[PDB]
Write an enzyme that holds these catalytic residues in place. Structure first.
Site, PDB file in Angstrom:
ATOM      1  N   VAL A 117       1.218  -1.630   0.503  1.00 26.15           N
ATOM      2  CA  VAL A 117      -0.530  -0.163  -0.039  1.00 26.15           C
ATOM      3  C   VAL A 117       0.616   1.220  -0.157  1.00 26.15           C
ATOM      4  CG1 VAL A 117      -2.009  -0.560   0.850  1.00 26.15           C
ATOM      5  CG2 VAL A 117      -0.239   0.347   2.676  1.00 26.15           C
ATOM      6  N   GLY A 118       2.081   1.495  -0.015  1.00 20.34           N
ATOM      7  CA  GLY A 118       3.233   2.964   0.400  1.00 20.34           C
ATOM      8  C   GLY A 118       4.025   2.156   0.618  1.00 20.34           C
ATOM      9  N   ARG A 119       5.280   3.124   0.649  1.00 18.99           N
ATOM     10  CA  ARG A 119       6.818   2.772   0.493  1.00 18.99           C
ATOM     11  C   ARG A 119       7.461   4.171   1.236  1.00 18.99           C
ATOM     12  NH1 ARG A 119       5.711   6.471  -1.302  1.00 18.99           N
ATOM     13  NH2 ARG A 119       6.165   6.765  -4.188  1.00 18.99           N
ATOM     14  N   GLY A 120       8.524   4.491   1.789  1.00 12.90           N
ATOM     15  CA  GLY A 120       9.402   5.064   1.976  1.00 12.90           C
ATOM     16  C   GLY A 120      10.723   4.529   2.096  1.00 12.90           C
ATOM     17  N   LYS A 121      11.729   5.596   1.789  1.00 16.72           N
ATOM     18  CA  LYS A 121      13.005   6.078   2.012  1.00 16.72           C
ATOM     19  C   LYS A 121      13.322   4.492   3.208  1.00 16.72           C
ATOM     20  CE  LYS A 121      14.274   9.517   3.012  1.00 16.72           C
ATOM     21  NZ  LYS A 121      13.172  10.158   3.016  1.00 16.72           N
ATOM     22  N   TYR A 122      12.478   4.601   4.652  1.00 15.21           N
ATOM     23  CA  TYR A 122      13.011   3.524   5.260  1.00 15.21           C
ATOM     24  C   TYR A 122      11.851   1.902   5.328  1.00 15.21           C
ATOM     25  CZ  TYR A 122      15.594   7.853   6.205  1.00 15.21           C
ATOM     26  OH  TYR A 122      16.162   9.489   6.318  1.00 15.21           O
ATOM     27  N   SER A 123      11.154   1.346   4.455  1.00 15.20           N
ATOM     28  CA  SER A 123      10.212   0.852   4.606  1.00 15.20           C
ATOM     29  C   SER A 123       9.226   0.499   3.422  1.00 15.20           C
ATOM     30  CB  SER A 123       9.141   1.415   5.875  1.00 15.20           C
ATOM     31  OG  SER A 123       8.291   2.159   5.315  1.00 15.20           O
ATOM     32  N   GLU A 124       9.101  -0.706   3.305  1.00 11.50           N
ATOM     33  CA  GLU A 124       7.789  -1.087   3.118  1.00 11.50           C
ATOM     34  C   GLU A 124       6.285  -1.319   3.410  1.00 11.50           C
ATOM     35  OE1 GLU A 124      10.649  -3.773   0.189  1.00 11.50           O
ATOM     36  OE2 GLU A 124       9.155  -3.475  -1.363  1.00 11.50           O
ATOM     37  N   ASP A 127       7.577  16.260  11.604  1.00 13.88           N
ATOM     38  CA  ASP A 127       7.248  15.835   9.482  1.00 13.88           C
ATOM     39  C   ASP A 127       5.610  16.061   9.339  1.00 13.88           C
ATOM     40  OD1 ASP A 127       7.715  14.969   6.984  1.00 13.88           O
ATOM     41  OD2 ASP A 127       7.845  12.815   7.640  1.00 13.88           O
TER      42      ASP A 127
HETATM   43  C1  LIG Z   1       4.646   4.223   4.098  1.00 11.30           C
HETATM   44  N1  LIG Z   1       4.160   4.346   5.574  1.00 11.30           N
HETATM   45  C2  LIG Z   1       5.062   4.888   6.285  1.00 11.30           C
HETATM   46  C3  LIG Z   1       3.421   3.933   5.622  1.00 11.30           C
HETATM   47  N2  LIG Z   1       1.923   4.641   4.774  1.00 11.30           N
HETATM   48  C4  LIG Z   1       1.074   4.229   6.254  1.00 11.30           C
HETATM   49  C5  LIG Z   1      -0.464   3.655   5.859  1.00 11.30           C
HETATM   50 BR1  LIG Z   1      -1.472   4.257   3.782  1.00 11.30          BR
HETATM   51  C6  LIG Z   1      -1.171   3.362   6.896  1.00 11.30           C
HETATM   52 BR2  LIG Z   1      -3.090   2.701   6.399  1.00 11.30          BR
HETATM   53  C7  LIG Z   1      -0.626   3.335   7.912  1.00 11.30           C
HETATM   54 BR3  LIG Z   1      -1.767   2.843   9.607  1.00 11.30          BR
HETATM   55  C8  LIG Z   1       0.361   3.670   8.290  1.00 11.30           C
HETATM   56 BR4  LIG Z   1       1.669   3.029   9.917  1.00 11.30          BR
HETATM   57  C9  LIG Z   1       1.443   3.897   7.310  1.00 11.30           C
HETATM   58  N3  LIG Z   1       3.170   3.863   6.713  1.00 11.30           N
HETATM   59  C10 LIG Z   1       3.893   3.813   8.271  1.00 11.30           C
HETATM   60  C11 LIG Z   1       3.699   4.866   9.406  1.00 11.30           C
HETATM   61  O1  LIG Z   1       2.791   6.142   8.975  1.00 11.30           O
HETATM   62  O2  LIG Z   1       3.927   4.862  10.622  1.00 11.30           O
END
Ligand SMILES: CN(C)c1nc2c(Br)c(Br)c(Br)c(Br)c2n1CC(=O)O
Length: 327
Positions: free
Chosen positions: A39-46, A150
Site C-alpha cells: 500500500v505504500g513505501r518510504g525511504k525506510y520501509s515498504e 514531519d
Molecule cells: C509508507 N508509510 C510510512 C506508511 N504508509 C501508511 C499507511 Br497508507 C497507513 Br493506512 C498506515 Br496505518 C501506516 Br502505519 C503507514 N505507514 C507507516 C507509518 O505511517 O508509520
C-alpha cells in the site's frame, strides 16, 4: 529559545519514559500476520495491508529496511508512549523474521484515500473538522513531550466514510528537552519552518505548527504545496516572497542569526503579500476571514509567536466543530 508550553514534561517524569535506548522490545509472533497487498513505501520501509490470522481483522504491516538499533528504538518507544492518545496511529505489535532479523511494526488499519484525490472533494466544514482532529493529535503528543517533526498531508491518514483521522509516520519524532540543539534536517522540504532553514537548532513543538500552517494554506487556497521550493535555500526564498523580508530581518536579529552570504543574496528584498492575494474563483469558498486570521497566526517567522495546538483548537475558526462535539 525554549518552548512556551510543556517545556518540562520530560525533565520531571521518570527517566524510563524518555530514555528510549534502554527499551527492550517484547517480540510477538511473525506468523500471526500475513501480507495481502502493498500500500505504500518510504525511504525506510515498504508498507502492506495485512491480515491478523487469529481474528481475520485487517492491519498494516510496516516492513523496515535495515535500520540502526538507536533509531528504531526511538520510533518504538514514542509509539508506545503515545498509543491510546486521540488520533495517534496505534502500534499493536512488533515482530521479526527469524533468519534475517528484519523487524515489522504492526498498526491498526485505516482505509485511507490519497490526499491528492481526497482534498479537492472536501467541503469548508470538512476542512475545519479534519484540521481540528489533527490538532487534537498534536496537542496530545506535545503534552507528552514529543515533537512529531514531519507533519504533512502524506502523513495524515483519513477514512472519510468513518471521518477518522490518524497521524502516522513517527520516524522523525523526538523527545523535547529544553535548550537541546537538534538536527535541522527534519521535516519534508515544503513543510520546513523558517527555524530549520536558517539553522536555528534549539527549536521545539512550534515547528509542528508551521508545518500544519503549510498544510492548511495548501487546503484553503488549493495550491499544493503552498511554498514550492526546490532545495532548502530556494524554500526560504519562496517563504520570504510571501511573508516579506522585513519580518525575516526582525526574526534573525531577535535570535542573533546571520544568514549565509549566498543565501542572503538569493533571498533579496520583498514586500509582504496580503493573504487575499492568493484567493481566486476556485478557492474563494474557502478563504474567509476566520480562515485567514487562523492561518496568519500559524505562518509566523518567529516560532515563539505561533499559536500552540491548544490555543488553535479554541480559535473562532473551529467554533462549529466544537459545538457539534459539545452535542
Ligand atoms: C509508507 N508509510 C510510512 C506508511 N504508509 C501508511 C499507511 Br497508507 C497507513 Br493506512 C498506515 Br496505518 C501506516 Br502505519 C503507514 N505507514 C507507516 C507509518 O505511517 O508509520
Amino acid at each position: 529559545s525554549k518552548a512556551r508550553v510543556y517545556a518540562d514534561v520530560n525533565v520531571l517524569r521518570p527517566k524510563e519514559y524518555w530514555d528510549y535506548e534502554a527499551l527492550t522490545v517484547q517480540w510477538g509472533e511473525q506468523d500471526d500476520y500475513e501480507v495481502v497487498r502493498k500500500v505504500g513505501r518510504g525511504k525506510y520501509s515498504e508498507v502492506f495491508e495485512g491480515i491478523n490470522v487469529n481474528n481475520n481483522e485487517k492491519c498494516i504491516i510496516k516492513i523496515l529496511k535495515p535500520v540502526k538499533k538507536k533509531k528504531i528504538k526511538r520510533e518504538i518507544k514514542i509509539l508506545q508512549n503515545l498509543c491510546g492518545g486521540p488520533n495517534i496511529v496505534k502500534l499493536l505489535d512488533i515482530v521479526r523474521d527469524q533468519h534475517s532479523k528484519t523487524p515489522s511494526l504492526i498498526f491498526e488499519y485505516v482505509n485511507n484515500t490519497d490526499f491528492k484525490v481526497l482534498y479537492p472533494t472536501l467541503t469548508d466544514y470538512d476542512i475545519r473538522y479534519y484540521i481540528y482532529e489533527l490538532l487534537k493529535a498534536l496537542d496530545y503528543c506535545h503534552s507528552q513531550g514529543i515533537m512529531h517533526r514531519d507533519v504533512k498531508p502524506h502523513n495524515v491518514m483519513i477514512d472519510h466514510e468513518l471521518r477518522k483521522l490518524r497521524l502516522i509516520d513517527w520516524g522523525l519524532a523526538e523527545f523535547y528537552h529544553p535548550g537541546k540543539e537538534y538536527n535541522v534536517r527534519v521535516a519534508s522540504r515544503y513543510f520546513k519552518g523558517p527555524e530549520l532553514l536558517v539553522d536555528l537548532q534549539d527549536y521545539d513543538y512550534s515547528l509542528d505548527m508551521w508545518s500544519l500552517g503549510c498544510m492548511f494554506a495548501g487546503m484553503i487556497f488549493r495550491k499544493e504545496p503552498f511554498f514550492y521550493g526546490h532545495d532548502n535555500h530556494d524554500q526560504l526564498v519562496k517563504i520570504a516572497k510571501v511573508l516579506g523580508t522585513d519580518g525575516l530581518n526582525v526574526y534573525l536579529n531577535k535570535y542573533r542569526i546571520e544568514l549565509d552570504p549566498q543565501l542572503e543574496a538569493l533571498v533579496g528584498r520583498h514586500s509582504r503579500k496580503p493573504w487575499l492575494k492568493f484567493m481566486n474563483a476556485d478557492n474563494q469558498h474557502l478563504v474567509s476571514p476566520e480562515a485567514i486570521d487562523f492561518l496568519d497566526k500559524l505562518l509566523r517567522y518567529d516560532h515563539q509567536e505561533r499559536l500552540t495546538a491548544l490555543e488553535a483548537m479554541t480559535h473562532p475558526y473551529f467554533q462549529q466543530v466544537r459545538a457539534a462535539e459539545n452535542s
